[PDB]
Symmetry: C5
Subunit: 98 residues, 5 copies
């Protein structure tokens, strides 16, 4: 199994790593029908989503949990692995340090 | 998909954006039958619910209630709410926070 | 829908509103068989439960209420009011409101 | 219903109240097959477990077991002072039935 | 039941105890399909995973995997010192079976 976000990311098609190296500027969360999604934003101008939604179901909910608490604690994100065939780019993985 | 709360809100009928720019004044939570809901309040005088589940959105209602609770307790400044205004109190569809 | 804990409370029989205006003094949680409950306590001497499960909507709510009491206790968050069923010993929590 | 941990404890066979009046010294959590459990420790020398869910447990206890493990983790992380533990003492380590905290 | 992480580690095959006595350096989490996993990293050079749920996991492990990942995240965010890890050493990276923290 991969031992880093970059390794994991290189396994998938239509992905790229973003080096964020920053805390989340804004956190948006919606329960509107067909837009049950999370949107985060950075002062870089970068916008990301956790897409509207079976072990992936639990993982999707975990990701949204992680982004929320990461925003609330002002935790510095190292990288994001995102799918770049979506607008905004959809999050596949997150890494944080230190 | 939408890239902001304002864009998301615009996709829907009977919605409006409230600018809060404030922390939540009060959090109310009920487990009473037929009223399994949260109610939040602001010093502006605004009152909103997350509304009782009824006829993918089920986990989202739960997440919103989660978010509002931790937001209240940490006194986190809410930016905007997107709400349905065909209900009283207005029902939350989306929330945004900026740091 | 109701707009406050007081309005909500007045929709049900065998309820009343206690004005707590204080943090939780003690938190007790049990996983014993048929006593899967939370008990909370205040300086006033008041004692309340989240009572053992008997609707499908309510099961998720009972669990949330217990989550809420726990973190309310750990953060020393002032409870404004409790809406409670007074046909139980101790009184059983239907709703909670929090404001400083 | 019982109105205190002591009252509740007295309702079951093979239980006692350990008065702890201290924070958790160590939290141990396992996802190893058939030992999906939590062990907690105090500087008194006390070791306790939340038992693995099994045939001795009724359906209603399953969500409660998960809750108790939640509480112990957050209790450990926050250095929250535990007042009493109600434990079953026919297990090794003693098994947590209930916990109480006072501020 | 075992009364410590080392005792627990000794009930299983293909396990070893890593003594960390350190907070987590990095936390990585993925919802990518077939890689629904968490990876953690320490200053010592060590790397660990909580592996994707799979056929090798029994049904009681499913909630424990989710819990282990909940624990690691919050451990990372609070900078809480991890004492020991019980890891399966027949996976790369080593897979977490148990965790202990002490202060
Ligand atoms: C309001 C807000 O936060 N964002 C809105 C904004 O976002 C785009 C802009 O910020 C531009 C900068 O001109 O960058 C777009 O991203 C590029 C990306 O650029 C690189 O990363 C960004 C963050 C900057 O640092 C650039 O200097 C970098 O070159 C390219 O590498 C990538 O290949 O293509 C996208 C172009 O789409 C921002 O787009 C958003 O964020 C990125 C990460 C994607 O997820 C994309 O889908 C998002 O839309 O402007 C857009 C409209 O263009 C929206 O209004 C955003 O809300
Ligand atoms: C005490 C308390 O918190 N809430 C009770 C109160 O709520 C209403 C009042 O706060 C009035 C004051 O004018 O505004 C209502 O909202 C209006 C809204 O007003 C605008 O926004 C509020 C926050 C204020 O800042 C106003 O000055 C603004 O003009 C209008 O713009 C909107 O179009 O219509 C509503 C009323 O229909 C408050 O209503 C509550 O909160 C809003 C956001 C909705 O969710 C609404 O459904 C709520 O009722 O009075 C009401 C009864 O009028 C209840 O007793 C509340 O509990
Ligand atoms: C030790 C402890 O915390 N509780 C034990 C105690 O609890 C009862 C006492 O604290 C008495 C003291 O008068 O009050 C009971 O509550 C009354 C209630 O009194 C009013 O509210 C409380 C908060 C106090 O402020 C009183 O001074 C107030 O006047 C009345 O409002 C109500 O009509 O009647 C109840 C019960 O008669 C305490 O009862 C407990 O808490 C209340 C809120 C209910 O949930 C009730 O069911 C509880 O038993 O004594 C009991 C046994 O009587 C147990 O030993 C508690 O552990
Ligand atoms: C390493 C560690 O933390 N614990 C290991 C230890 O645990 C036992 C010791 O701490 C002995 C010391 O004699 O006490 C055992 O508990 C007794 C209990 O003793 C009293 O309470 C403890 C907490 C201390 O304060 C003692 O000084 C007190 O005398 C007796 O009162 C009771 O009647 O019987 C128990 C034993 O059953 C400790 O046992 C552990 O903790 C208790 C609370 C139970 O849950 C028990 O099952 C635990 O084993 O030694 C054991 C060896 O079996 C393990 O190595 C522990 O990990
Ligand atoms: C970037 C990063 O953090 N880690 C990458 C790194 O990890 C390996 C290295 O850090 C080497 C350094 O020699 O150690 C490997 O672990 C050994 C282990 O060594 C002992 O533990 C480490 C942490 C050090 O403190 C050593 O001094 C200790 O002696 C031996 O005990 C064990 O028998 O064998 C492994 C060799 O695989 C690190 O391996 C990673 O972490 C361990 C715990 C396993 O989980 C393993 O699967 C991991 O790969 O290099 C590897 C690839 O070589 C990856 O890129 C890591 O991400």
């Amino acid at each position: 199994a991969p031992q880093s976000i970059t390794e994991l990311c290189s396994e998938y098609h239509n992905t790229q790593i973003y080096t964020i190296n920053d805390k989340i500027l804004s956190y948006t969360e919606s329960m509107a029908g067909k837009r049950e999604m999370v949107i985060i934003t950075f002062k870089s101008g970068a916008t990301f989503q956790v897409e509207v939604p079976d072990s992936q179901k639990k993982a999707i909910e975990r990701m949204k949990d992680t982004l929320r608490i990461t925003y609330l604690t002002e935790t510095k994100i190292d990288k994001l692995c995102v799918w770049n065939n979506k607008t905004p780019n959809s999050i596949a993985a997150i890494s944080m340090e230190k």
